[model samples]
Target chain A: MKLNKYIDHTILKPETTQEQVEKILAEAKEYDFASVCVNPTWVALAAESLKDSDVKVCTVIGFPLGANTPAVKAFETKDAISNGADEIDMVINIGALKTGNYDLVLEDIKAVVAASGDKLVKVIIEACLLTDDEKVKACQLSQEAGADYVKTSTGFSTGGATVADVALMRKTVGPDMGVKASGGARSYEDAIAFIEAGASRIGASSGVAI
Target chain B: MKLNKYIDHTILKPETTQEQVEKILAEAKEYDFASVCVNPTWVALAAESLKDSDVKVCTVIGFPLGANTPAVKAFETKDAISNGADEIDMVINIGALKTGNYDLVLEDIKAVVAASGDKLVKVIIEACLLTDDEKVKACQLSQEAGADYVKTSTGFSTGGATVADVALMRKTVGPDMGVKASGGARSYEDAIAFIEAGASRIGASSGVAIM
Candidate 1:
């Protein structure tokens, strides 16, 4: 398997400077990773930097907090795509999920997926804070909601990807659904573990080192 | 009722400049509002400006969004207090609340309240999106959680404060509990109505104009 093609280089800090964006692009290019993920503000820069390369530019919507209304998230996803983002990583409304208000959560995801059209959409469930049942529900919801992938964690949560969780998620989504393991994935071993557990995409800040 | 003492004049936009902060303080001074609210980065500046004045300085924790871990929220509260914040307005983990995990929500608020010691803790419920039942449960939860006040909205939600919501919240929390009406309170009449509905505190972006 081409492991490099499954990697997404990421940087989401508020204080991330322009130099850091440049470094991220260079690393993605050198590693021949699948994509380079940056904050919404840097989508254009990443797109411009990775022009003519195989690497895609990805940006987040509603970020670490999914408190923004669905309309806002749709607008953000549209704006990101217009700014040249090839992929959109959006946070799911954890509040809606916890309340068992599955309809609202599903509609929220559908809005972004529809706005994204043909563009790839990855739903960040922030699995660390959720129960196993919630995680399975979220994966099923994402699949039903038409998302391209269901991702784990925003990295701002209390924890990140665990091997057991990834395996469980893989089983829940089955073979056809896309699964992404993100947050605190620092080493090569961690990346491989996620892959073994059925992660189609691995989001990490240290893709170059890995 | 001393209405001026119940207000927290706030400005939290990222582009808020020093001159704007000075303007906010000037308005707070002119109106005799209870406190001047700002983002965490401007706590010291606001405190320095309001020194010796009756007006206190309030800063936000886990602000706008309540996704930050409880540990991070506690640490941020401690730092803001040390920087001279007299009151702390924090956002509740809506996620935890929606999960029916009331204990997590209680513990989250308790950690901040414990960290603040004697300082005031105003919990923002961002009530606009909540159903009537959810709103009642939130107020009851906050009161039982020992927060000094239960606030209405964050002004970032799709809708802001409504008279009916203020009344519902007031009735649920009872007389002894503190009720705060916040977000989209732009007029003097709105402020008066909230106070009449049993809100002891008013959190407004336009407190100067409203007062």
Candidate 2:
């Protein structure tokens, strides 16, 4: 598999700076990664910086916590898109899922997908927080919400993606939908394992090495 | 000082459940604490649970990590208020402050304050991540934006409230504005230190014991 095509160069830390975003934009452009994933605040900068390149600008909504209300997430989605974000990766409300409020979780994803329009939407399940059953259910909900991908973890959460979670997400989403193995896949071997397990995309800060 | 009045009993963990919120509501009402600080998703439930009691419904916006865009934070604030949040605790955009984008940080706090209106607004500066200089600037900006309180930490971050930070914030915002000392205070002693340092409000999950 072509590594660059599968990688979404990312930096969504709370303390991320303008200089860091600029640095990554240069790195992503030189490496020709699939996209550069940043926080919503930097979407405009990333979009403007990557305009001359083939790399797309991706931004996270609700982010690491996934605790924002659906309206807030949708507003964030619309704003990010208007600022030139090519893709939206929003965290599903993990608390809602844990509380058995499946409808809220589903609707939350739908709101972002609806706001995203034709742009690709990836629903981050924050896999480390879910049980095997919850992970499967999260993938199903993502598919039902018209999301293009089922992503694992926000990387800022308690745990990052595991091989088992990736396989389960891929199995649940089936062949057509995308499975993105995000968070903690730092090396080529780690990347290969996730890709082999059916991940169509990889999100990491260390994309050049992979 | 009336300890219960100073406490904004909180549970904002990402893994918080309906049961956990229900339990905290019972505790807050039984103790007749100031308010119950919860996530936006639980505002209506909290409001309904504590309706007969004097305890107010409080919620966090752009919580813990405040990297959200201003528009999103304002939307969260408005929604929380409509759901019966009597007070709003919002984390400022720390990244902007660190980058020296003072205007962005100032406007971010102002957006939430504007949405809050008559309700109380506490700006969580996440003091654990900043230098003494940043903490002072954060409190000053919060005051200039017309926020009701300048708070310390989200408790989920690297560190919680400290006496020194509380004193600095109190000194910066002066006597008229409110200063909230949140996170890591589990005893009467912890509460006392903050209050003595000019904290008008205390945010903790351990309010009952402090009494």
Candidate 3:
């Protein structure tokens, strides 16, 4: 598989420096990855750095903890897009999802999507923290709420993506919708396997090695 | 050592619920913890529940990760205060601090404190991620930024509180400013050790156990 296009080079460490972001962008340009997944604050920096490249700038909303109010998350999505982010990945309120509050979960996703306007919105399911059934429901809710993709993990969570989670997310979203496997996709095999398992995108900090 | 008023009963878990927040508020009311520390979304609930009490409603800004831009962090600080946060615990831009960009870090703290208006603002330095020099500089910068307190950790970091870190922080800020020890002060003795070392406040999730 020609794997460079599916990669979304990521660096979401809380301590990411401007120079580090530059390094990430350099690699993204060299590898021609699908996009550069960075923290929300650095979207403008990435946009500036990759002005001449085909790579897009992706950022997160609500981040590792999806505990912020819906209004706050919506504001973050809007702000990131305004700063030149091409895509938005918002963490679902795992608390609401686990409480079987499907409507709250859907509304949270929909609020961010609507706030995103015409920008692509990816809902980070953070699969490691959810059960199999919860995973399925999360993907379904994401699809129903009109997210552009259902991402697997935040990499800050307890664990990262698994083959089973990717396969299930892809299955739930069906053939057309996008499914991204992130978090633990470190090696070539890891990325290839997830792609083979039906993931259309990959988020990795170690994109160079892959 | 009386730990009641010095304690800020906290629960910043992402999975916290309305029911859980109500329970936390009830505990805050009954136990008389310094404040009920919660996520931004639950600030209004804490305010309503603790309206009759002296306990303050404390919430986090930027939280475990301080990667949000100054504008977003400023917006969050305002939202929390408008929703009834009597105090704010804002995590410093750890990356910026580590990179020696003291200006960025200072501006970040200043923005949040200004957004907070007259409310209390505590800067969480996430001590585990810094060197001794960085820690001292962080405390000094927080003090200079007009922050009310310099907090030890977010508890989600690689390490928690230590006597050395607390003492250094106390030394850096002198006796006038507040020093909060959080993350690993799990027991009464642990809290006391920090207090003896000059911590003016203690942040613990296990508030009931310590009481």
Candidate 4:
């Protein structure tokens, strides 16, 4: 399998520097990964650096903690798109989801999707914080909101993607919709297993290592 | 000293529930706290609940990790204010501060301060992650930006407020500006120590226990 094509080279920590972003950009270009996921602040820099390449510029919205209001998240999406982002991965309001506020959860995803227009939107379920039933519900909500994909974890959460989680997400989302396993898939074997379990995209800071 | 008046009964975790917010609101009203600090989503609920009480509604901006752009932090501040927040505690772009991008960090605090209008603005520097010089510079930046207060931590970081950090922050900001110690101040003694070290306010989830 073409492992490189499925990876989104990422550097999203709070302390990421310009030199670090440059290094990741060079690595992504040399490796020819699918995209480079970064925070919104670096979207313009990343986009300008990858202008000549096929790799897309991806950014996170509402990010590691999905507590921002829907309006704020939508604003972030539009800003990222304007900054030349090709994909948006947003976290749903986990508190709202856990409180059984499905309507707000659905509306939150829909707001980002609408703001993104045609740009791919990946709904981060943050599977580590949810139960199996919650995971299934999150996947269903993502699909209903017209998201392009359902992703697992923000890498900052307590846990990352597992073989069982990916397999379960793949089954819940069915065969058409995309499933992205992020957070802790560190090695080539991990990426292959996630892909085999039905992950179409991989978000990792270890793209070079993989 | 009236310790309850110095506390911002806070619950800003991503998993906080409406019920927990209600509980905090009740505790704040009963104890006569300065405010009930909550996430933006619960601001309206908090405002409604404490309408008759003397307590204010406080909310955070760019919390925990301060990587969001200035525009986003401004938007969040406006939303929080419009939703009835009386105080705004915003985290400075820690990465920007670390990279020596003082201009961006200053502008970030300014954006939130402007959005807050007449409301109080507390700038959280996440001091645990900064060196002594960085912390001093952050306090100076907050003072220059006209923020109402300089806060120590978000409590979600690797470490929370310390006596020395509060003392240094207080020393940097001088006598007029506010200094809030948050994160791990869990007891009455902790609150008193912070106050003694120059803290005017305390942001903690253990308010009841402190009382």
Candidate 5:
């Protein structure tokens, strides 16, 4: 397998400086990773830095917490893409999911997906925080909502991606839709494990060695 | 009506400059408002600005969104108080509240309240986003959870304080419990309406003019 092609190197912190982000992009160029994940504010800078590189630019929408209004999330997605983000990882409104308010959750995802247009939309279910039923519901909802991939976690949460979650997500999404395992996959072994469990893409903060 | 005393003038945006906060404090001083609300990062600034004045310093825990873990919220509350905040407005975990997981919500509030000790704890319900029944339950939960005040709206949500919702919240919390009408309370009339409906405190972005 082409490990580098499946890697989305990420750095998301309020205190992260521009120089740090530039270094991240430089490393992504060196490693030839699939994309460089950054916060929305840095999307433009990342786009400018990777102006001639093949590495895609990815930024998060709704972010670590999925509490923003759908309209806000949509506008944020549009802003990020306009600034040159090629992929959008959005957090599914966990409140809606846990409440079993699937319609709102589906609409929330769809709103972002529609806003993303042709850009890849990754739906972050934040699996560690959900039950098995909720996780299954999230996958089904993501598929119906037209998300290009079902991503595992936001990394800021209490826990990150687990093997069981990747397996279950893969089973639910099947062979067509992609499954991106993210949050706390800091080691080569962890990354390989997620891939073995059927993850097509890996989202990690530490992507230098892996 | 002493409207100014009930108002907590606030500005917690991340990019808020010292000059802007100093201006906010000057406005609070002129208005003689109850407190100057700011983020924990600016608690000391607000506290020092309001020192020797009757006005208190109020800061938020968990802030615009209340998804932080209980431990983090408690730590934030403790740190804010140590930094001189007289009151703390905290957002409830809407997810926990909606899940009928009152225990988590209760524990979350209790931890902060305990950490706050003598400092006032205002529970922000973010009312506009909740259903009518959910709103009522949240008020009851806040009261049961031992918060000093139950606040309406976080100002960042789709809706803000409404007369009917404030009235309903007042009815649910009963006579002695404190009710705070917050989020988009733009004018004096809006402030009065909420006060008449039973809101003891009013949190507004335009607090100076509202009073």
Candidate 6:
């Protein structure tokens, strides 16, 4: 139950509703979860919904795609934060990262972290798309770019978080930064396994189950 | 051979390489395809690769997922254009469209369309995520927003283009706008089926086989 504080109960489906978000928020508050992760459109609503609670209003930027240009992602990060998002979960450009353009990747993340101001910016590396070498480099670039956390996936991809990936990210980012295991970690055991592997945070809609 | 003119040969896998894109461009130029559809990172290379040819350089905006905000998509549209993308294939906001937020959805497409200027904008509805009614509405909104085409699927979705969806989209947009059938249309028959059903364009890696 104490793991609730590290969980971001998330809902990113295209057909999500305000009422459903509220119901989820009610669970978050009851469960004492760390935050309620929603899409950028619902950030303000989440802010209001969880105002009286200790839970933070976490929202995604550039979302699952993460192919948007740096300028656009920066604007989105700024917009999301202004909308009262306490934390920002943004996807990095998988194409750029894979193109061997490490500098571009670092700059792209730095722009979002700058746009996020003092808010926490979690970079979703979409672990499934990357090789083990790529995952380590992704963590190196993200941490060097000043992001607050390294998240595993957007859950829109073909695969989700794995214990090995979580451990790799943790070992790569070291102790200073946070590691979030999202996507397929749906059960208490799965969540615990990710945690034990060195993840500091969890992103799931099934936080109560954990 | 004439079929080559209506296809944008696409390769968007993250594992795709420069050499792979170079080969596709060579084939595209050799076959006179409409364009080489690549991810944003390769747009500049595509532009350089096909500079002397009639084949256009096309790239995706917001890519396989169309959930980004309007501002971001618009910026992506502009960025791709600046990188020498002659045509922009963009994904529409599935969440907003599914929620019945027609105005936001329309405005989102319109923003990218506006950003595209004289360039062509093909809106990917990611057909697999939507309902039958949602498909019609998506096409209606895309046409109304002034986009040049409505594309089905990103090939990364649960499903891709079907003959029925293409027919419905064509019926909704009428003959004025283009209907692009992509994702899973890898064979000659599949691509032809979509075209016969009213798709004006086809996006596929199997462009060689389809032609």
Most DockQ-accurate candidate: 2
Task: Quote each prediction's TM-score.
Answer: 0.55, 0.97, 0.95, 0.97, 0.54, 0.92
lDDT at B147, model 2:
90
TM-score of 6: 0.92
DockQ for candidate 4, C-alpha atoms: 0.73
Write candidate 4's Cα lDDT for B51-157 as tens digits: 99899999888876788888889998998898899999998888778778999999999988888889999999989889999999999999999989999998877
* Tens digits of per-residue lDDT for model 2, B53-146: 9999999988767888888888889998998899999999988998999999999999998888699999999898999999999999998998
Q: Say which candidate scores most in lDDT.
A: 2
Off by more than 4 A, model 5: B1-211
Indicate the residue-level lDDT of A2 in model 1. 52
lDDT of 3 at A110: 92
Cα lDDT of candidate 2 equals: 0.90
* Candidate 5 residue-wise lDDT, B105-140, digit = tens: 788788888898888899998887688998898888
Q: What are the root-mean-square deviations of the candidates from the true structure over C-alphas?
A: 18.4, 1.3, 1.7, 1.3, 18.3, 2.3
Q: Candidate 5, residues A1-210: lDDT per residue as tens digits?
A: 558988998987533555777889999999999999987656877899888888999988766666444655677688778888899999887765765568878888988998998999999988877889889999999999988999999887678899899999999988889999998587888889999999999998788755
For model 2, report DockQ.
0.78
lDDT of 3 by residue, A1-210 (tens): 478999999998887788898999999999888999988768988999989898999999998888787878888888898899999999999878876778878888999998989888899988888889999999999999988899999888788889989999988999999999998677999889898999999999889864
Residue A35, model 5: lDDT of: 98
The deviation in Å at residue A178 for candidate 5 is 0.9
Clashes of 5: 0
DockQ-superior candidate, 2 or 6 = 2
lDDT of 4 by residue, A110-163 (tens): 999989888999999999999999999999999999998999999887899988
lDDT string for model 2 (A89-130, tens) is: 999999999999999999999999989988999999988888
Ranked candidates, highest lDDT first: 2, 4, 3, 6, 5, 1
Sort candidate 2 into its docking category.
medium
Off by over 4 Å in 6: A17-19
On the 0 to 100 scale, the lDDT of residue B41 in model 2 is 84
Of candidate 6 chain A, the 10-residue stretch with the lowest lDDT total is A62-71
